[PDB]
């Protein structure tokens, strides 16, 4: 029993963290085989960060403009190219700790683990969700740029995020491992703001199913709802429109608990209008949206506490 924000074991990812210094800027890079990936803004000074032209800035650099350090040992750069918002630094060694891996761009609502890193040195791990507005509510200080987010399935690390910057609200922006930003955000210092966020309906529903799997059903009711009547309510409360795709994704969970999706929707509709009446669900006073249906299957019992 129990239900917590659980991250993936971080070992396979720790073996790939290095430091990258260019001129006077130090940040973190990702060492896979004989390549090191990092944010391109490593090639910027303070002055440069407003209004940079990376083509022009990068062409003013050689292989030995870049310093990369794996633990104590210096790695020599022998090739460089730019790819969207990242740099790809070819090095003299292939990482002996390179795990099997993949580069995936994740979709809003999906979760991943983040290894927060400073000076190429791993300092903590946490779980979060890619928000609808393409930000993450992480925790980063200066020097965390190039810290990565990932999923582990079996033995294979799926890299989905690299950190680049922080926004005025205090939430975070970055890139997939092709160097393409999540969101309409850019690689420079201007007036940029997170767009308005929404609560992640599919995940709230997943988390309700977990509450039941773990033996709680106080919030259930006798009603049912149509998808469209649920949406009219979802909009009032700043929840995402629920779709048939989302209803199909909830099938296995509906089957394990014997509660129909649309019945759980009426459960939730009622939670939204009436409040939680001073009660908790899986130890929380609010509706939780940072667990996917997958996260619930992984973490919970396959056997319901009936």
């Amino acid at each position: 029993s129990g239900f917590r924000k659980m991250a993936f074991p971080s070992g396979k990812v720790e073996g790939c963290m290095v430091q990258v210094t260019c001129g006077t800027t130090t940040l973190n890079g990702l060492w896979l085989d004989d390549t090191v990936y990092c944010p391109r803004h490593v090639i910027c000074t303070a002055e440069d960060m407003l209004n940079p032209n990376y083509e022009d800035l990068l062409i003013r650099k050689s292989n030995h403009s870049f310093l990369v350090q794996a633990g104590n040992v210096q790695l020599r750069v022998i090739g460089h190219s730019m790819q969207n918002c990242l740099l790809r630094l070819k090095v003299d060694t292939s990482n002996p700790k390179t795990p099997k891996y993949k580069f995936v761009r994740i979709q809003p609502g999906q979760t991943f683990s983040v290894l927060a890193c400073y000076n190429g040195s791993p300092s903590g791990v946490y779980q979060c969700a890619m928000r609808p507005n393409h930000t993450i509510k992480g925790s980063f200080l200066n020097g965390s740029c190039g810290s990565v987010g990932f999923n582990i399935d079996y033995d294979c690390v799926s890299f989905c995020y690299m950190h680049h910057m922080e926004l005025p609200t205090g939430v975070h922006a970055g890139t997939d491992l092709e160097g393409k930003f999540y969101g309409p955000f850019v690689d420079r210092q201007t007036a940029q703001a997170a767009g308005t966020d929404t609560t992640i309906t599919l995940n709230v529903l997943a988390w309700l199913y977990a509450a039941v799997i773990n033996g709680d059903r106080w919030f259930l009711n006798r009603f049912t709802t149509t998808l469209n009547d649920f949406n009219l309510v979802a909009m009032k409360y700043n929840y995402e429109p629920l779709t048939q795709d989302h209803v199909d994704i909830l099938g296995p969970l509906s089957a394990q608990t014997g509660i129909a999706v649309l019945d759980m929707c009426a459960a939730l509709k009622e939670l939204l209008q009436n409040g939680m009446n001073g009660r908790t669900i899986l130890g929380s006073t609010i509706l939780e949206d940072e667990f996917t249906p997958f996260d619930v299957v992984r973490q919970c019992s396959g056997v319901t506490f009936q």
Binding site: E166, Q189, Q192
Partner: peptide, 5 residues
């Protein structure tokens, strides 16, 4: 303003 970290 934003901040590249």
């Amino acid at each position: 303003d934003s901040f590249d970290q």
